Amino acid sequence: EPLNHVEAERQRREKLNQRFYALRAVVPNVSKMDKASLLGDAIAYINELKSKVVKTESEKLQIKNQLEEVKLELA
Amino acid sequence: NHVEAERQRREKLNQRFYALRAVVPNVSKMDKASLLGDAIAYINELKSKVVKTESEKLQIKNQLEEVKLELAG
DNA sequence: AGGAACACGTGACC
DNA sequence: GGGTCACGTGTTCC
């Protein structure tokens, strides 16, 4: 019996399904319950988040300029 | 239908795994499972920075309004 | 030598 | 049904 190949395949399959559930717990608003749809919404969620990190760190630098401009106008 | 139908489902999935590698940094020759694990870790690092940066921004916006007030007096 | 990691066809469940 | 999941199998890489 080639059994240890059948069991090893069973653990891999289990580890991945464990990961899918953890993915479902952090990605907001998924409604088609299929696996392909899950990954699709995950990719979109990641793009949206890095896009926001870039806009916020930029807005912060920009407001740091106005503060510096007004200190200079002061005196 | 039925062999062909299964190839279409399998292909739809495999396309998406590869795209996942293209949006997360440093995950090139990894396992499918470790890939999903790091995607989760990266989503967590990403929200975390959004919160921290927005905190820093407010601290600076409060400071701006104070000097605006000193300027107009 | 055998563990790891992948894609495949087939049976079953809605 | 059409569409999805789980399973054992065949393969290749160290």
Contact A24, A38 (CB under 8 A): yes
CA torsion angle for A20, A21, A23, A25 (degrees, to 10)? 170
Q: CA of A33 vs C1' of D1, distance in Å?
A: 20
Longest dimension (CA), chain A: 88
When divided into structural domains, chain A yields a total of 1
Query: Could you tell me which of B39, B67, B2, B61 has the C-alpha nearest to residue A50?
Result: B39
Per the structure, the complete domain to which residue B45 belongs is given by 1-73
Chain B partners within 8 Å of A45 (Cβ): 43
Q: How far apart are CA B46 and CA A46, in angstroms?
A: 8
Q: How many CB atoms neighbour CB A57 within 10 A?
A: 17
Q: How far apart are CA B25 and CA B12, in angstroms?
A: 23
Q: How far apart are CA A58 and CA B6, in angstroms?
A: 46
Q: How many CB atoms neighbour CB B39 within 10 A?
A: 25
Q: How far apart are CA A14 and CA A10, in angstroms?
A: 6
* Interhelix angle B3-23/A35-73, nearest 10 degrees: 20
For residue B2, say if its preceding peptide bond is cis, omega within 30 degrees of 0.
yes
Q: Which of residues 10-39 of B touch A (CB under 8 A)?
A: 12-13, 16-17, 19-20, 23-24, 32-33, 36-37, 39
Residues with Cβ within 8 Å of residue B67, at least 6 apart in sequence = A67, A70, A71, A74
Q: CA of B3 vs C1' of C10, distance in Å?
A: 8
* Interhelix angle B32-71/B3-23, nearest 10 degrees: 40
What was the elucidation method?
X-ray
Count interface pairs A-B at CB distance under 8 A.
Answer: 84
Cα angle: A45, vertex A51, A52; to 5 degrees? 95
Is the Cβ of A69 closer than 8 Å to some Cβ of chain B? no
